[PDB]
Design a protein around this ligand. Sequence first.
Ligand SMILES: Cc1cc2nc3c(=O)[nH]c(=O)nc-3n(C[C@H](O)[C@H](O)[C@H](O)COP(=O)(O)OP(=O)(O)OC[C@H]3O[C@@H](n4cnc5c(N)ncnc54)[C@H](O)[C@@H]3O)c2cc1C
Ligand SMILES: N[C@@H](Cc1c[nH]c2ccc(Br)cc12)C(=O)O
Length: 630
Amino acid sequence: MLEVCIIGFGFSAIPLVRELARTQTEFQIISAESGSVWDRLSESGRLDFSLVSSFQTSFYSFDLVRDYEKDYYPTAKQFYEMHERWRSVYEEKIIRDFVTKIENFKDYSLISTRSGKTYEAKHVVLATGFDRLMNTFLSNFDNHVSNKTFVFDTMGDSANLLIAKLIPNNNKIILRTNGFTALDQEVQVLGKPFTLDQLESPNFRYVSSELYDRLMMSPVYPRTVNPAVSYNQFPLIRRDFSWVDSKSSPPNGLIAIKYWPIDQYYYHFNDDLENYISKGYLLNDIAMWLHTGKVILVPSDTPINFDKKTITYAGIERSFHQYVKGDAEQPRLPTILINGETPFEYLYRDTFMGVIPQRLNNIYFLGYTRPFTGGLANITEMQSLFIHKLITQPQFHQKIHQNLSKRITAYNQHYYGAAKPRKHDHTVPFGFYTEDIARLIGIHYQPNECRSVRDLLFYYAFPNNAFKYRLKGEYAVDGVDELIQKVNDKHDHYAQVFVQALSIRNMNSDEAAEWDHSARRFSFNDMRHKEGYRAFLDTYLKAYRQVENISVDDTVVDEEWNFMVKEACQVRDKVAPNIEYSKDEDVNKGIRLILSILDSDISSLPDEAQSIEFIRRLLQPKNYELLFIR
Ligand SMILES: Cc1cc2nc3c(=O)[nH]c(=O)nc-3n(C[C@H](O)[C@H](O)[C@H](O)COP(=O)(O)OP(=O)(O)OC[C@H]3O[C@@H](n4cnc5c(N)ncnc54)[C@H](O)[C@@H]3O)c2cc1C
Ligand SMILES: N[C@@H](Cc1c[nH]c2ccc(Br)cc12)C(=O)O
């Protein structure tokens, strides 16, 4: 009898397959001849974009320990090429077939395929990915279309990439939506670029949820009246967050689009523009789009007639080429029959950690948890270790399964509270989720075991990437020690984010919100760093056009657009003139102090002032309890 059957092989299954091979656990892989989105993109020649996520968080530890030399954003092509190298390694283990049904019994499953071949497996892993409605617009939709109006109903990473490809052909973009959360994928810290995922210091939640909340949420919730922030210049981008019923911030179920702010795009690519664009580094600055009016927001309830293909805003009945419904995404599960008979119904909240479903035996879900920021690799790598330990160690299987029902209840209380199930429940802050899996497995770190200030930085400030937990113990990866030193050496041991937490320990929500926005350039949606980039933007559009052999005339005028843009940008034409310290000042001093006491013993530190008292209490954080683990 087959010990393990993995269904679907793309990206998510790689780490688990690796661990099963290591313990010589008997496994077979079944995966469709047709492959995935990435093969459609490959063969239609549309691997012509880059990831929104850092190398550090998008490629697995066993690759990073060989190939990390610096932070960069991988291209679509580099991501697919990495899928194809790992497929080649394991191709002998893969049956090319399509699973149509799983019949789940007490300690085994009967798997049906389209060939009609049947397989019996004690443990079954689904790593089948998602059906995504937007994939067609990326796969197929045309790059010649020009000067048309498009209406999007929702704003996600796919819509934002499509908008990036549309804008250089003078296509006009209308977002009719109930707000969206966008974040600069990169932040300049004392002149050095940090991806946003490197600045979240998530283990500060254990100190207090209130402190973690005021440190993180001012770019998301409208807490500052600083007139430089997009959610003040363009109030329509604001969301209804009344659904949120949890002390854990940022909450599970929050989604953001991550985008290149034009200032950082310039710093990276100005020097060799066309060649960078040709590689898939595309400018997707939604905030620069709202600034220059190439995108406009209109109310959620703005009247639209699909019969005549017109939207009614600014007293103008406006004609559009295409309405884009908006990315719904569904896990590609085959029919699963409970005890051979009753169809299983998938709901994220009814699985433990997005992996273990109820009323099924020895069936695990790999790849159906989405990270709030950073790449999927961090999530799937930790899920792979969790599944590996559940499949190979019966004691661990029993320990998790015995009280599965109450772990799930305790998880849902902590992270969702009394909120109704939502379609984005599957979205988790990466640094909570990786840490949660690490504590479940026992490869986590103990704050009490920190000895030096250096150790405290590693524990609190070093990002909770999967490879953080493969330094030592049960799932150690060779070379992770040198990886961490490289990453620490390049990011000043994450002293800046440690200092951020220190700066707001004694503030309230509102004070923290003002402080986070006092910078010359604050991290997210800073509308002061747009105007001075218009010259660069034309160099960009021209370079893009040259790359894609496009002709277009920038003298054509859509006076109806102008009335709608000016109607749209009314609040901005009021607020932006009100524009015009602390964060820049506090960071620069804090970092000097911290770097000075790096190798100082914590326990020994004497009685600036209560910042030492605070640093000492980090050995004994008061909000460490996670009842889905304990
Ligand atoms: C446009 C786009 C951009 C993305 N950008 C990023 C990014 O910047 N950073 C990031 O970290 N992530 C990103 N992702 C998300 C993620 O990294 C990819 O979706 C990834 O391909 C998911 O890998 P997977 O193994 O879960 O699924 P897939 O890659 O889809 O692989 C699943 C495989 O299972 C097969 N299969 C499905 N059902 C069956 C069945 N019943 N029987 C047999 N075989 C089956 C499929 O044919 C496929 O070959 C992006 C996704 C998309 C679509
Ligand atoms: N005070 C932090 C906020 C931050 C940093 N990184 C983040 C990522 C997601 C979200 Br929501 C917030 C952040 C910063 O500005 O560096």
